[PDB]
Amino acid sequence: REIVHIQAGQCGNQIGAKFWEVISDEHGIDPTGSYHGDSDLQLERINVYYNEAAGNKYVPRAILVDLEPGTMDSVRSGPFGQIFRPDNFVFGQSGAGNNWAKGHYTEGAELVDSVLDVVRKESESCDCLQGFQLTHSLGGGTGSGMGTLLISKIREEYPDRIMNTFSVVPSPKVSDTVVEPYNATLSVHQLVENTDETYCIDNEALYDICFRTLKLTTPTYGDLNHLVSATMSGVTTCLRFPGQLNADLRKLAVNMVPFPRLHFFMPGFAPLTSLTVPELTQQMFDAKNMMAACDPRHGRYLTVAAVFRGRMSMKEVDEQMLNVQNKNSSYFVEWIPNNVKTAVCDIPPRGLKMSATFIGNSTAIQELFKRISEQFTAMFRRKAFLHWYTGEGMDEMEFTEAESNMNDLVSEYQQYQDA
Amino acid sequence: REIVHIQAGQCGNQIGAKFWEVISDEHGIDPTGSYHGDSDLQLERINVYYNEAAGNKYVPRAILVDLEPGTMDSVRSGPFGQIFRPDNFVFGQSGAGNNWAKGHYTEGAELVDSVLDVVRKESESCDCLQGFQLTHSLGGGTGSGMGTLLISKIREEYPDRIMNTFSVVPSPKVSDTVVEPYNATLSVHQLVENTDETYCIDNEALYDICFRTLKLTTPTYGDLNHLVSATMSGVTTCLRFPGQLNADLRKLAVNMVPFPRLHFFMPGFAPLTSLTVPELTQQMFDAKNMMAACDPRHGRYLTVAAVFRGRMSMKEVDEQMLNVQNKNSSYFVEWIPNNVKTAVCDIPPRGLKMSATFIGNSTAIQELFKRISEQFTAMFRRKAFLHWYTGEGMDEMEFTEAESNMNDLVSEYQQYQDA
Amino acid sequence: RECISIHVGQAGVQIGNACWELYCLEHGIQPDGQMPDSFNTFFSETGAGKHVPRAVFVDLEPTVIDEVRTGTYRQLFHPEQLITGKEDAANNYARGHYTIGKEIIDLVLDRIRKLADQCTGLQGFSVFHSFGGGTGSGFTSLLMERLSVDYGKKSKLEFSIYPAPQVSTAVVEPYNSILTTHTTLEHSDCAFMVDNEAIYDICRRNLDIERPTYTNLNRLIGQIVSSITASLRFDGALNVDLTEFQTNLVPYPRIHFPLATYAPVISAEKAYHEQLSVAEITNACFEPANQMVKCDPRHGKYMACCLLYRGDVVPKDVNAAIATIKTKRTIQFVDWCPTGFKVGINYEPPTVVPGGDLAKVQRAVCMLSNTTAIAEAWARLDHKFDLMYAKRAFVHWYVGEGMEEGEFSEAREDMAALEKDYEEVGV
Amino acid sequence: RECISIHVGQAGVQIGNACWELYCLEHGIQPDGQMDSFNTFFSETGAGKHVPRAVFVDLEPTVIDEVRTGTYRQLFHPEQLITGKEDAANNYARGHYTIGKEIIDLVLDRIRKLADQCTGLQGFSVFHSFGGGTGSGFTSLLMERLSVDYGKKSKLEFSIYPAPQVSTAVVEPYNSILTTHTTLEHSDCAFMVDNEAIYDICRRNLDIERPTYTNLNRLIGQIVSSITASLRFDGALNVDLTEFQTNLVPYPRIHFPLATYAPVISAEQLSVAEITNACFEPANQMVKCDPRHGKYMACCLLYRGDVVPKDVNAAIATIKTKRTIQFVDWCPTGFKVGINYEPPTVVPGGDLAKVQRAVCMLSNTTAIAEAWARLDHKFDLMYAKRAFVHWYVGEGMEEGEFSEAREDMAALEKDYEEVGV
Amino acid sequence: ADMEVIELNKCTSGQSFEVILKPPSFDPSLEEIQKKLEAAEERRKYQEAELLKHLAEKREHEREVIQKAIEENNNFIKMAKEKLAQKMESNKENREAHLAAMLERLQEKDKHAEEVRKNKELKE
Ligand SMILES: Nc1nc2c(ncn2[C@@H]2O[C@H](COP(=O)(O)OP(=O)(O)OP(=O)(O)O)[C@@H](O)[C@H]2O)c(=O)[nH]1
Ligand SMILES: Nc1nc2c(ncn2[C@@H]2O[C@H](COP(=O)(O)OP(=O)(O)OP(=O)(O)O)[C@@H](O)[C@H]2O)c(=O)[nH]1
Ligand SMILES: COc1cc2c(c(OC)c1OC)-c1ccc(OC)c(=O)cc1[C@@H](NC(=O)CS)CC2
Ligand SMILES: COc1cc2c(c(OC)c1OC)-c1ccc(OC)c(=O)cc1[C@@H](NC(=O)CS)CC2
Numbered sequence A, B: 001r002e003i004v005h006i007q008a009g010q011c012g013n014q015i016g017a018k019f020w021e022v023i024s025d026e027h028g029i030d031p032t033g034s035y036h037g038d039s040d041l042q043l044e045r046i047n048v049y050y051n052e053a054a055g056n057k058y059v060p061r062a063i064l065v066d067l068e069p070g071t072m073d074s075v076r077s078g079p080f081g082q083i084f085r086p087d088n089f090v091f092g093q094s095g096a097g098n099n100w101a102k103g104h105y106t107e108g109a110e111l112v113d114s115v116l117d118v119v120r121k122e123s124e125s126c127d128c129l130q131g132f133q134l135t136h137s138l139g140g141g142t143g144s145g146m147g148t149l150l151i152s153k154i155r156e157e158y159p160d161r162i163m164n165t166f167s168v169v170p171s172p173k174v175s176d177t178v179v180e181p182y183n184a185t186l187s188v189h190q191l192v193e194n195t196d197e198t199y200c201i202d203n204e205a206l207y208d209i210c211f212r213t214l215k216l217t218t219p220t221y222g223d224l225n226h227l228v229s230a231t232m233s234g235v236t237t238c239l240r241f242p243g244q245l246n247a248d249l250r251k252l253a254v255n256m257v258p259f260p261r262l263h264f265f266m267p268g269f270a271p272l273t274s275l276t277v278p279e280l281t282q283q284m285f286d287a288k289n290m291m292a293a294c295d296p297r298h299g300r301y302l303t304v305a306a307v308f309r310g311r312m313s314m315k316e317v318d319e320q321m322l323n324v325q326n327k328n329s330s331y332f333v334e335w336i337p338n339n340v341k342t343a344v345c346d347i348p349p350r351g352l353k354m355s356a357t358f359i360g361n362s363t364a365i366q367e368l369f370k371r372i373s374e375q376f377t378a379m380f381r382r383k384a385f386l387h388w389y390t391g392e393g394m395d396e397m398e399f400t401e402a403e404s405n406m407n408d409l410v411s412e413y414q415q416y417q418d419a
Numbered sequence C: 001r002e003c004i005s006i007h008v009g010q011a012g013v014q015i016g017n018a019c020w021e022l023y024c025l026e027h028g029i030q031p032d033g034q035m036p037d038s039f040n041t042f043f044s045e046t047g048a049g050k051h052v053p054r055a056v057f058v059d060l061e062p063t064v065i066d067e068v069r070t071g072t073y074r075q076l077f078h079p080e081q082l083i084t085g086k087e088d089a090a091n092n093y094a095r096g097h098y099t100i101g102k103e104i105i106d107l108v109l110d111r112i113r114k115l116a117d118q119c120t121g122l123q124g125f126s127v128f129h130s131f132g133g134g135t136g137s138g139f140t141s142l143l144m145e146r147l148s149v150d151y152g153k154k155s156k157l158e159f160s161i162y163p164a165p166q167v168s169t170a171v172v173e174p175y176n177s178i179l180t181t182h183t184t185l186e187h188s189d190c191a192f193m194v195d196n197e198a199i200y201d202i203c204r205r206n207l208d209i210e211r212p213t214y215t216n217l218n219r220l221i222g223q224i225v226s227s228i229t230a231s232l233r234f235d236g237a238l239n240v241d242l243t244e245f246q247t248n249l250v251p252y253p254r255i256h257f258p259l260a261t262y263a264p265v266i267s268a269e270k271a272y273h274e275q276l277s278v279a280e281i282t283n284a285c286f287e288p289a290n291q292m293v294k295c296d297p298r299h300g301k302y303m304a305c306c307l308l309y310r311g312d313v314v315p316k317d318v319n320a321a322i323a324t325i326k327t328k329r330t331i332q333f334v335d336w337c338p339t340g341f342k343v344g345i346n347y348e349p350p351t352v353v354p355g356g357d358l359a360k361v362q363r364a365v366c367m368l369s370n371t372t373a374i375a376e377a378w379a380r381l382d383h384k385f386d387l388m389y390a391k392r393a394f395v396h397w398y399v400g401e402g403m404e405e406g407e408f409s410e411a412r413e414d415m416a417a418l419e420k421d422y423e424e425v426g427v
Numbered sequence D: 001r002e003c004i005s006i007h008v009g010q011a012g013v014q015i016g017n018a019c020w021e022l023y024c025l026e027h028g029i030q031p032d033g034q035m036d037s038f039n040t041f042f043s044e045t046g047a048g049k050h051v052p053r054a055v056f057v058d059l060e061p062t063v064i065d066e067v068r069t070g071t072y073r074q075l076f077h078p079e080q081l082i083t084g085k086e087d088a089a090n091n092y093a094r095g096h097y098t099i100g101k102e103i104i105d106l107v108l109d110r111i112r113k114l115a116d117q118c119t120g121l122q123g124f125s126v127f128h129s130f131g132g133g134t135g136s137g138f139t140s141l142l143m144e145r146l147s148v149d150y151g152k153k154s155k156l157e158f159s160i161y162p163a164p165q166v167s168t169a170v171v172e173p174y175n176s177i178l179t180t181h182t183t184l185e186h187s188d189c190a191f192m193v194d195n196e197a198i199y200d201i202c203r204r205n206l207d208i209e210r211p212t213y214t215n216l217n218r219l220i221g222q223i224v225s226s227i228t229a230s231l232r233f234d235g236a237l238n239v240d241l242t243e244f245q246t247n248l249v250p251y252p253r254i255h256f257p258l259a260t261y262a263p264v265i266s267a268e269q270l271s272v273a274e275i276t277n278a279c280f281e282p283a284n285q286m287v288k289c290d291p292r293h294g295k296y297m298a299c300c301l302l303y304r305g306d307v308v309p310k311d312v313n314a315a316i317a318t319i320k321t322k323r324t325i326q327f328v329d330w331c332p333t334g335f336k337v338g339i340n341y342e343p344p345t346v347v348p349g350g351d352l353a354k355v356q357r358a359v360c361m362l363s364n365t366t367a368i369a370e371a372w373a374r375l376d377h378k379f380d381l382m383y384a385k386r387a388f389v390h391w392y393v394g395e396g397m398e399e400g401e402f403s404e405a406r407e408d409m410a411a412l413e414k415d416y417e418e419v420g421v
Numbered sequence E: 001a002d003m004e005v006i007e008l009n010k011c012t013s014g015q016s017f018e019v020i021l022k023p024p025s026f027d028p029s030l031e032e033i034q035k036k037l038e039a040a041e042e043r044r045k046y047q048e049a050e051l052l053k054h055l056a057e058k059r060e061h062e063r064e065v066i067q068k069a070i071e072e073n074n075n076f077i078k079m080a081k082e083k084l085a086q087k088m089e090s091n092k093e094n095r096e097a098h099l100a101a102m103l104e105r106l107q108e109k110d111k112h113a114e115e116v117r118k119n120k121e122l123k124e
């Protein structure tokens, strides 16, 4: 029915910025101006992602948050910099963090209200608010710590509506901080409690896709974001476009998450880099093509949701889609009936004549949580860099309490490879 | 001395309508107007079936009852539609039934009084009231259920006078409802108790006469009524015409029914469809020509009454009538002396130069009651469509109480094939 | 001296309707009223013109009586001697004797007493009624009971019509006959039975009518009756007194029913033929084919014979006819009883209806015999009754009006007895 | 006399959208407004217009909005189209409790606004989805309350049983079981329509590789038309509801008759004997299963068009000679035959052609319970792990109501099987 | 044959005479009783006074049926009108309680942050 979009912390801001300019050109929107493009559809549900202001203008329902100016002015003087509403930006000024604590307590709390009070304006402006979606990183802190806070404070003011996040889980390769595992674990715990669905974009997976399968040597933060950015458009398509489903985003939740513990989705895309259909499915169901460092093999799928794109015959899709869960019919939990649903839309993405994307609630995701909990208990062992948080006000046992909650999540996913 | 005629429920109304227009043209009566026809007799006992009003006009002593308009307006805009007295029609408006309960309790009782108090005005108008005759079906409900009620309420207000009915007993072929057996059994019981004579017009018999012996493929409700309608004129002739008998209708009762349990007559007609005398008798005494699905062979006759018609010599009649109960002298109970009486009248019916009709109190009628009790106990076994009645207020054991009474009726008729 | 006629119920009415007409013709009384004692026996000289009968007609429905107040003879009676009753007898003694009767009995009873009041020394009543048949059995029985209460001595002579299959009866008929003939028996002095089959029969062999009407039968019965009364209407020996009627025919209180045989019955058209000999008609009197109750006395016995002649006849012949009627015939008289033959001649010739089917005749005979073979009819009826009652055939209609199942037994019980008495009189 | 139609939720709405259009074409009512008998379903409003006796309800606009858009826009009143902003979410628990409560009073009152211009109403025909948000939830609640405001008045539901391919939702089986429980003691007779059976008929017959909703609905439209028809025309087959059901359901347990449509054949004359013959053919049913297995306890034949009983008879005779009669122990051999001379009109740009004569056959078999099994299994197997239950407990439902409902389906499946010889 | 007849009476238009043929050879109706008649009245009036007291009997079982009907319906409404209402009270109380337990835990891992930021005041 209508969604607001919070976007916070260097990674989040950059990630979402590409998202925005990517869907904007899908809908045919200028840096400010409105429509331009012989298509007609687009506008039906443009409502959903764009509160529209004075005259023509389209301005996205987006809130921009950070704890240091730079990253924001990167957007303003950038791609679709002019597009966002001016007093929708919320600067930080003070020290960033790159330490959870700072963002979820001290330098964080400081801002919260001034952001919360702007989401409050956007929301109450909405004719019928569907929920919020936020982009941020789990490592570092100006969005992994303020973010998990922002959401802890959205529920309470909005228990009602649902919480959606795209969270980049960090890795040992392509990382700026030794502490990431601390920041990661500390958030994972928070996400588990106050969100309905969370998409995992693993940076380990991400790097692997660029170099391990794309000849791209030094992977910028750039061609890497291009992956996430394309994936994110694929994942939302059905809520921003046709008249096939409609996607209550709550329907999406009620149908993808069998168990309360908000289960985390691993996404996957069809063609890539900066397509026969049988060729498209074979790829979209391949580990070598997941957005999270996992491998659905070492684990069953709870429920899967796939969404195609471009002029192609569903007759073939429904056929191939059955042919996957057959040549692989052991990897689809049999205690949940028609647990794999496919949606087709006919408006091609950027370049690409054909395209597909994939959403998967798979117990293999366990693998991901295990590997961050591996460098965590591997450092929190002989209390590592911990004194950086102790100092900002946190308690020693708030770490064990997080670690403990997290391992259960592994001990639950591993419980559902049952029968 | 003078009789009123109640006519209720789609079948009854249709059946009687043909009766009326059939006797009216016998007597020479216009849609409204009076006499027209070089005959003179007619008028003697025109009294009996016609209370006569303003100016010339003849208007039959008839009451019209139903629980749904349609069927009545079928008569008004029909054959002798204008003939009946306007506020003599008693509409129902509400749901019909085709379920006894509704007509003998709920939707029934609702009307009763408004009818009862119109029969009351016709009766008290009569110079010397002889009794009532009613036409209705035993299957279905707006006349089998209200009807059996109307009569239960006539005795009580008129113990005095006698109750006469022509009741169409239904069959498995040419039927609109699965429940008929329930409706039938439920009335049969009632008839047994509050009527002096009942003529059985079996529809199974009826259909058989049209197709089994008259090349008539699809038997309408039309050419089928034509049979009943002709039979009914034959049965009454002696009370509406000459000066041979006179027929107290009570004399007819006291003489045809040896045993209290109102014994049901099977009627039979001579020539048919829409004639030497020996040829006429041979036919009028044939199973293939009875109005009820029976076969006097599988049973003796208690008493028989036959009434001829047309210019023919009684010398021959009395001779042939003796010759039947001779070539068949075993089938006339010998414990009742001159138990077969014949009446001759000389005013020909419709078309027909010669005609005869037959009234028979025969223990073979047992066969008919047995076959409706067969589909009844065959359904009431594992309590069938019963909940349709339970619901309208009836008790479970009011069904067993009816079934029980009815089987006795068979066990009594079967008792009198004695010696 | 005087003499009241009572006609109850259809058959009763219509029979009298036809013999009151033969009466008029016999005494020459033009319908309306007068002629331009003797016959005072039966009429009361009312007004200073009219002649009017001493009769009462009763039926429980109008119809029949209504046709009397219509056809000529309309003027002949008083409006009050014609009582009528709206609601029918229904065809069962039980109604006529109890239910529907009670209501009209007080009005009849009183009117017949209104007639007996202008009669210096009344004689008795001649009552005409059907045997089976609604009010004929029922009301009659009740009338007679009460007539015996209000008129102690005065004799009661019934003229009953015994029913027969062909001249249409009613299934229940036999019950009704037995029923009435029971109550009614200890109250009558002498009764004349008339078998409808016998009369239907005479109309065939003689008048030659394929389909004999009531109006055809009644005319004939008229004649038999005329000949029976006659004696006490013209005055001239033999039965010139109701008492003398029983004294001559009934030897036993058991109301004995004499057997009547009419002389020459011959159709007009054959009219201008040859006058039948005095010897011949007597000879036709001892002939079963000419009786009034189908049966035969060549079988049983005679315990009182009577010859009633009418017309041109001298005793001298009546004698020689009797002589030869004994010689080659079945005399068979009974043990303890003379050889009766109280002969009566009534010079006044036998007049017959004008458009009638029988012709004028020079001389006619009557013969009233009390035989034991008349009980053959009491049998024929019992069997019918017995056989129906074996299953309570129609009994419930009677219990219905308020009769006891016991009265059915108790009545057949008498008929068992009578049939015994009859047979017991044999040698 | 009268007759209200209620369409709740997407499927409900769209189905009715298509059979209210076949209705108009049948009675010739130019969308705009005008052209008793036809009065059973319409109320002669204004001194021109003809308008339906219907109410459409959905918990999101979308669907209803297209109705107030495409022609037929004029056909209804603005009031009979109720819409609700917030979605049903796909879980009974929401439709029946949370989100429903808010719109029930406004619907309930408007349908009474319709029943007020009806001298002696008859009952309601209700169209709704089996699984599906408000189709299961709201419906159930409506029916509970309709029973409170309308004592006697019968309730005839037209349910859509869900099928894997014409896309369902993982939670569908929960929803179906759930509604069919509460809803059961309140309906008089219900007509189930298997989406697989209709998808199926559109393939073998119309020859469409990818059957649309708009393609399915058209066909369903026809089945429904033939069902009501009798009481719209009027003096013909199953007159005044009651005598309709009194004909099919022998037991209070709401019995769901099995519907079979006559000749379905694509545009671009079939013998009277032949279409009857096609009626006793599994491939042409409305609920995938087969009665050559179970038994029949009441058969009905509803013909339409050019037909004399003379044939209908000889078609029945031969339809029993070399066939699986299999009638049940204590019940005649039904065959309440009804002919409705008025020919079968079909939509103009439709996929089916005009046909000289068509049959309907409504049978109450025991084999229809084969569908109550196929659903239980799905439900039972998911519930074995509280699969999605927490979403329902979330809106405020008891885990017990899940037991208590399947508990009835265990019972029903028993009753069905218990009627066998 | 050989008869000899004696003659009793000779009138004006008559003559009676008996003729013996052969020597034969041998050797209170009660008035009161109208009470018999009016015993039948009081037995027929019984018969009918019966199939009447026995008929108005059926009558007040017709009242009973029309009655167990309307009262059959009532106890469907006023039993399943409060089967709904006291279940949509089970509902409000349940969710309101589910949503109140979801804030209870939330406003406390909130009022802990506040109370352990006031720990950074004594700490740093
Ligand atoms: N001989 C003769 N017999 C008759 C006549 N009318 C009727 N009967 C016979 O009388 C018997 C029936 O008696 P009804 O006089 O009809 O009986 P009812 O009750 O006195 O007369 P209703 O009150 O009119 O019924 C049958 O045995 C008939 O054959 C008649 O005119 N002449
Ligand atoms: N036959 C048919 N089935 C439909 C149609 N639309 C949806 N369905 C089916 O209906 C079920 C889902 O019901 P919905 O109408 O979507 O549920 P709803 O809550 O009533 O409607 P929403 O509020 O939009 O969720 C599934 O079985 C679908 O296959 C339709 O137009 N025709
Ligand atoms: C409606 O008019 C009828 C009325 C009656 C009779 C009848 O014949 C069947 C009628 O025709 C239908 C009738 C009946 C039957 C008898 O017993 C079988 C009988 O003896 C006698 C009769 C009729 N009476 C007679 O035949 C004596 S002549 C009178 C009752
Ligand atoms: C964001 O938009 C989406 C919204 C939804 C679904 C979905 O996945 C295909 C989406 O794309 C990511 C969806 C999901 C899941 C299901 O079970 C796995 C389902 O049955 C069904 C669905 C979608 N509905 C249908 O397929 C209805 S026929 C609706 C909810």
Ligand SMILES: Nc1nc2c(ncn2[C@@H]2O[C@H](COP(=O)(O)OP(=O)(O)O)[C@@H](O)[C@H]2O)c(=O)[nH]1
Pocket: A008, A009, A010, A011, A012, A014, A015, A096, A097, A098, A137, A138, A139, A140, A141, A142, A143, A144, A145, A168, A170, A171, A174, A175, A176, A177, A180, A203, A206, A221, A224, A225, A228
């Ligand atoms: N793919 C994606 N990941 C990023 C990007 N920038 C940082 N990351 C990852 O996210 C983690 C923290 O991001 P950062 O923005 O520096 O944290 P912040 O202080 O909360 O804004 C790092 O450890 C990186 O692994 C980005 O541009 N795109």
Ligand SMILES: Nc1nc2c(ncn2[C@@H]2O[C@H](COP(=O)(O)OP(=O)(O)O)[C@@H](O)[C@H]2O)c(=O)[nH]1
Pocket: B008, B009, B010, B011, B012, B014, B015, B096, B097, B098, B137, B138, B139, B140, B141, B142, B143, B144, B168, B170, B171, B174, B175, B176, B177, B180, B203, B206, B221, B222, B224, B225, B228
């Ligand atoms: N013969 C005759 N029988 C009929 C007629 N109409 C209906 N019936 C029979 O009567 C039964 C039901 O009677 P119906 O009039 O429809 O019920 P009602 O509502 O009580 O009047 C059916 O089973 C038919 O066989 C008719 O026109 N003539």
Ligand SMILES: [Mg+2]
Pocket: B010, B096, B098, B140
């Ligand atoms: Mg009917």
Ligand SMILES: [Mg+2]
Pocket: C088, C089, C090, C091, C092, C133, C134, C135, C136
């Ligand atoms: Mg009589």
Ligand SMILES: [Mg+2]
Pocket: D087, D088, D089, D090, D091, D132, D133, D134, D135
């Ligand atoms: Mg929904």
